[PDB]
Amino acid sequence: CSYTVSRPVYSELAFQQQRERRLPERRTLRDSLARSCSCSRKRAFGVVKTLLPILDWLPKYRVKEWLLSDIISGVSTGLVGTLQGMAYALLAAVPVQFGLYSAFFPILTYFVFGTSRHISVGPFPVVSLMVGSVVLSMAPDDHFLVPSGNGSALNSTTLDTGTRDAARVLLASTLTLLVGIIQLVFGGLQIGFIVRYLADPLVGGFTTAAAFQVLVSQLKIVLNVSTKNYNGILSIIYTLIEIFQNIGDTNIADFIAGLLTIIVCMAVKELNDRFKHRIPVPIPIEVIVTIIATAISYGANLEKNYNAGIVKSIPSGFLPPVLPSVGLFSDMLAASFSIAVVAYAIAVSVGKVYATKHDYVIDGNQEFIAFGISNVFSGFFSCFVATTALSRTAVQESTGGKTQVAGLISAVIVMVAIVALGRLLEPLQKSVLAAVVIANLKGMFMQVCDVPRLWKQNKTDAVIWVFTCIMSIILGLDLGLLAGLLFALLTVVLRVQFPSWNGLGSVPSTDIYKSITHYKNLEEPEGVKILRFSSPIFYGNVDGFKKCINSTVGFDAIRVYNKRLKALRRIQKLIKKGPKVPIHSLVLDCGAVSFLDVVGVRSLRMIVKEFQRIDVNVYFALLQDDVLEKMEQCGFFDDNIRKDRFFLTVHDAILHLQNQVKSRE
Amino acid sequence: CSYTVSRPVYSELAFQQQRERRLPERRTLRDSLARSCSCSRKRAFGVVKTLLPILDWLPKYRVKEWLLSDIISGVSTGLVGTLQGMAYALLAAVPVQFGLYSAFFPILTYFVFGTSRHISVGPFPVVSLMVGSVVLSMAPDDHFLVPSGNGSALNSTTLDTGTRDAARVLLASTLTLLVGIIQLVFGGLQIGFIVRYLADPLVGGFTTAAAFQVLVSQLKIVLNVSTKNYNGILSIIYTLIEIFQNIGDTNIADFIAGLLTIIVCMAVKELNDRFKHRIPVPIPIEVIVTIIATAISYGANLEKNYNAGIVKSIPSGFLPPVLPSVGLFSDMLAASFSIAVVAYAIAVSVGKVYATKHDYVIDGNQEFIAFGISNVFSGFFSCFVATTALSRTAVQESTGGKTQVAGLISAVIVMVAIVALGRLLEPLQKSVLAAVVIANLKGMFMQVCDVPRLWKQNKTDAVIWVFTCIMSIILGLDLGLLAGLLFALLTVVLRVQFPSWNGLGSVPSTDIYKSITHYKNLEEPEGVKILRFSSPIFYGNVDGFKKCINSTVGFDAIRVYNKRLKALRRIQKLIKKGQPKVPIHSLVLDCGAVSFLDVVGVRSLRMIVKEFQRIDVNVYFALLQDDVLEKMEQCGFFDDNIRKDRFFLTVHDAILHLQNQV
């Protein structure tokens, strides 16, 4: 149809006279906390169902085919998870059995408190890398060597193989307990807005840098070299230079085997990902490559005849729960917070992906509480921080997963691989385990291809991606996230400090106002200069507003007034002996403002007062209701600054100006 | 007065098909790099005028209330400057001989370069300990430690003199020169936007604990309490509890002397404020309480007979300029960066606190080079850093003062006190001059009255004021402003993340759309609702914008889709076996107050459109004026079905679009 209206000019006062405002509701803090405190059995049952979602999806099971689906998904996910755990155990500097421990107990703890259906709780390469880094920083290698072995010249201060692993495991357990406590605190206190600051480019750059560091560490492990656990500033660059300098002390057989298995795994993964229409079930390349590696390494004595690197330290059993060593929280609080927030971000991302893929809901605070309880239970049984790997979750989702029972069955695989099975993997080379991690880095390595796409998009988002990726390499990985979130907040502040001000004008015989820098055939008011200023004025962009006004009016309210004062005294001395030509008004279209920051309303009133002395009216166009109600309490409407200065719409101000010019010459 | 604005409804594609755009100027620097100042002499004369802020106020002052007002004010702040030079020099581990030079030379170069009134350039208490910290670290206390003097058992390892303090002054002079060139090189690239981040409650909440810091720093000297030096965390608390713990060895004669003077000085001060219409020129009680204190001390021997504490160490005569050591600038460079930042922070914080009572807003670029070259001119003469004390800037502004000439005449008082008036203020009890700063300190102690005032105006800045106050007490004045600077910026990102979102509704027989939570007797279109987030959709408020929709529409687009397919599969098996949706048709997001968008916002906003599209409920938008519109189409928002037709220029066009469609 059409758009035509006719109404009087309600600027500020002609609107609030015949409009009865809605009185605010009574606070009544006592009755508010009393009424909010629920006591009926309905709320109790609701909070019990929410806190314990196990009683929700259990009674409505579909056992008929879900039994077979869950058993096959469980055996597959159990194999994949025990392989990923025995691989990531090297990233946390812990023995190979504690990876299987952290692949068994967290699943059982998440089965009774989780809210997802496809999330495979277990180890994670980035989290394991951060745990290993903080363990090396808190317990380096040169702090355990004991002089023994009747050395030639000095005391034989060889490696501390033995009690060193116990100290590392205790440190990892304390770290896991602290991370679980932090997650439970963040969950119970309903403080979940802290993880919203992890932007998509920020987390992308962080994952890219973490994958690069994981590649460096796994290359160090494959080459079988001995570094000095460089940590701190430029740790990755220093250890990479050391690797490049320590090439001579490598193992040719281990390097050849690692390169071969890397090529094979990458080729098989690419073939399975590309030609999916011919093979429905993904081929477990990890399982078959581990089997063939154990078979080849058992035929010939690869440990003695080839001097390879194997585990051969699997006791094939459990251990009683050990009390955590409390007291190391003050020196690892920041590291635990970083690990917890990155693990929660990755878990929420994986959950949202595999939930929008399967069309079900996943609660954030419930996942936080579940991961907290899982890490707390893991800290009592010598396990590290658990998360959900994108590669491990993909297997359970591709093989067909409906409920967490497949995860419970996935624990049975690790269960039988801990009690009796497990000692058969004795001659397995450590390079094979250190290779699948590199093969799983293809997902995060291909994330760099977004920079050419983000650069064509909003450039400020691309700068955050490059800055987060680079800064998370210089000053380590744990402190790199803190340097990324602060940089993102500073970039947000810069976008609200430097707005996009224009010369908004009206199309001929219209009422909508568009910018003048993007159109040609626009008419401007005779004398009046319209201005729009987004990014609401606060204490940091008030000088920007001053400069924008001075640029859009052509002059300055200070210099013109000083010139007028200088010309006035020349008149009073001449009688004793014997600029602002085009500018008529200023309509500020501050319609994109949210807050006002009274520190800035002071300068706004100062501007209004200064422009009044030079006989230049400064009006407003589209101020919001809440903004005006806030400015009223900030001392802005004095006996001279009435409400007639403000307006409701932009066209009403121009109409009032035209009417005043026509009725008053 | 009505007006006819009859115009067909214009969407985005319906407005660009008949109009024309303007070719955006890329403005490449390959040929436009010489457009600032090529040959025009007008731009060259402008930067020289701003470089020398002496040709602005000096050829413009009025001598009516200038001569007598600044002279009585200059001697007031000049006396305080002499006492600070005699006290802060001892804290910097250097001999107390150049303290008067730090108040004379920097003022001369700052009198011409620098436009910031009510500021007395000189030493600052918290910046003197930073200079003394790097001296004791990079220079041992005993350089030679000559073991001579025929002691009791072993050789008398007496501390070497003469050459020890000489290297201490040389090291301190090199640091001031290194800070000066670092302060000057910052003005090269013109980083003047850092001062814009200092809000009035930020500088107000900073110069209230510093007023408490300068109070406890002047309380230990007015009571003669030998306390240790404390810096870092809990610095103000540790010094306060030390005075209360070591209050025993307190000079009773000096206590009653300062207590009697602090009362009479503030009583006449408020008396002048009451009788300001009777006496035109304010009576300079500072020089009055000074001459009577030296009289009662010289005539009674308060030092050798009462132990009251006097200066008795006033130097005499200037010294020729000495060249510094350039080869030592490398070691001092690692520590001078921390001192140079905190020096400029306190320097401009005391300039903005007085910008609220007088319209004298200053610029950061000019003050960065003003204090920069002043410390350079302070260099080569074995002077101190070119900071500004909080006590001297209070005694100059409260007791008269019009321009910076009061600092120039104050240096003249220091110039005559070093060459000819050394023996005059010899028996000065160091109490009437150390407590006179507390009288003028009421101008900053009474600044806490804005907390109940700002609380009723805006709750956010009221918390910012009290946060910087309590944080500067614990973390000291060094980290107090730094932590408050990030906290002030944190309130900006929080107010933009959690806005006052409300559903809008039109007024009857009109096209004005306002919030329905603040009005009554409104109406809402049957099946069409309005939502105005009034905040940009960045990576932080992504889920907040989602929670704003599901809480306003009544239902949740996520839970109604899975239950729909669940019921669809439930009724599907019943056909083979044998056989809470709100009537709201669509929603129009009135996201017109958005100023910027990011990649996370345009991706999440696309998911919202695809989410409601599956529930047979359309989603429309509102005015995207110039930037938030072109950024969406650039980030890949329109692929096959989503087009610019769903947007609207005005909010009423969105309601009229859904009206005639049905």
Curated annotation (Swiss-Prot), chain A:
Ranges facing Cytoplasmic side: 1-70, 114-118, 196-201, 268-278, 349-367, 426-431, 491-665
Organ and tissue specificity: Highly expressed in the kidney (at protein level). Throughout the endolymphatic duct and sac, in distinct areas of the utricle and saccule, and in the external sulcus region within the cochlea. Expressed in the parotid gland.
Gene Ontology CC terms: apical plasma membrane; brush border membrane; extracellular exosome; membrane
GO-annotated molecular function: chloride:bicarbonate antiporter activity; iodide transmembrane transporter activity; monoatomic anion transmembrane transporter activity; secondary active sulfate transmembrane transporter activity
GO biological process: animal organ morphogenesis; regulation of pH; regulation of protein localization
Record keywords, A-Z: Cell membrane, Chloride, Membrane, Transmembrane, Transmembrane helix, Transport
Extracellular side stretches: 92, 140-174, 223-246, 300-327, 389-404, 453-469
Catalyses which reaction(s): chloride(in) = chloride(out); iodide(out) = iodide(in); hydrogencarbonate(in) + chloride(out) = hydrogencarbonate(out) + chloride(in); iodide(in) + hydrogencarbonate(out) = iodide(out) + hydrogencarbonate(in)
Entry-linked PROSITE patterns: SLC26A, STAS
Domain STAS span(s) in chain numbering: 518-657
Main localization of the protein described in the UniProt heading: membrane
Topology class, membrane: Multi-pass membrane protein
Sequence intervals crossing the membrane: 71-91, 93-113, 119-139, 175-195, 202-222, 247-267, 279-299, 328-348, 368-388, 405-425, 432-452, 470-490
Pfam families reported for this sequence: STAS, Sulfate_transp
Subcellular location: Apical cell membrane; Cell membrane
The protein's assembly and partners: Interacts with IQGAP1. This interaction enhances the chloride-bicarbonate exchange activity of SLC26A4.
Family: Belongs to the SLC26A/SulP transporter (TC 2.A.53) family.
NCBIfam families in alphabetical order: sulP
Role noted for this protein: Sodium-independent transporter of chloride and iodide. Mediates electroneutral iodide-chloride, iodide-bicarbonate and chloride-bicarbonate exchange with 1:1 stoichiometry. Mediates elctroneutral chloride-formate exchange.
Protein's recorded name: Pendrin
Organism listed in the record: Mus musculus
The organism's taxonomic lineage, starting at the top: Eukaryota, Metazoa, Chordata, Craniata, Vertebrata
